Amino acid sequence: MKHGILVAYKPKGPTSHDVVDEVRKKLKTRKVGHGGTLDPFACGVLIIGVNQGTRILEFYKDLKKVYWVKMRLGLITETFDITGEVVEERECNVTEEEIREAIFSFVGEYDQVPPAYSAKKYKGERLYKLAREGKIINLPPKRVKIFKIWDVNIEGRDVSFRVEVSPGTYIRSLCMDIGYKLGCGATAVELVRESVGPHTIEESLNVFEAAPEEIENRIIPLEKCLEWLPRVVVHQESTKMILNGSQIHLEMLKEWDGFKKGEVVRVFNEEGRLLALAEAERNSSFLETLRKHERQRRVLTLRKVFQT
Ligand SMILES: [Mg+2]
């Protein structure tokens, strides 16, 4: 039984659940999951958890995401994307300097709301305006972070660029907001998630067109997951008691990696096996002080044990 993370590529068309169903179908395993959905009209990286590997999906959903988008100026649909019913089409005639100025104006954080806008009375603009101001109660705004925007390319009414954003941010919403800044609305016509954390689309695999062996042989084992995050290794001998309960104490450790208090670290054994994930009860620099003193207290508190 393999345990790990699978870097899948979702083609434009199918839903994220469809991808999980395909993987589930070919692997014939016991557990398959996903983290951080991708709209049907978009394509790109979709993290897939397999068996015990699903237990660490939350960490992947926290990673940053990088998208490459293409929006049409002067077009407004119901869903804010081409697959949406055209509800309005204004006229745009702004300069490339006005566009760029608007685009790069969103770098930072701004509280956005889900894509609404209807063609009905008291539901088009005005509603969008109020929601945005945090005045509508059924549409609470969310605080998002637009880390950086680059590779902007203005070709007529259509413009494209790349953005590194925090999870939970709607790319469709970002376009529309930019579209209103210019004063003529905008709609997403193309969307590709190029990366999630260090996992890239070039690295991804199309499970739909992949043979079972391919998919299986392509999972990243737990030992290789969560590459970032400090790693501490405990003497082999402590493998069993850790796999059961048992917190980790000073004398049980063999190799640090440097960590702060509340930080989370990966617990390996001498054989290279990932035993668990734990939270640091102490600093790290303070360990030398716990030693030098016959004091051997708890140093790491068990968070997730991988009883594989
Ligand atoms: Mg689901």
Swiss-Prot record:
Domain of life of the organism encoding this protein: Bacteria
Q: CDD domains, from UniProt?
A: PseudoU_synth_EcTruB, PUA_TruB_thermotogae
Q: Which organism is it from?
A: Thermotoga maritima (strain ATCC 43589 / DSM 3109 / JCM 10099 / NBRC 100826 / MSB8)
Task: Spell out the protein name for this chain.
Answer: tRNA pseudouridine synthase B
Question: What does the protein in this record do?
Answer: Responsible for synthesis of pseudouridine from uracil-55 in the psi GC loop of transfer RNAs.
Residue ranges occupied by any PUA domain in the UniProt entry: 229-306
What is annotated as the active site?
39 (nucleophile)
| Family stated for the protein in its record | Belongs to the pseudouridine synthase TruB family. Type 1 subfamily.
Please indicate if the UniProt record lists Isomerase as a keyword.
yes
Answer yes or no on keyword tRNA processing. yes
- What EC identifiers does the entry list? 5.4.99.25
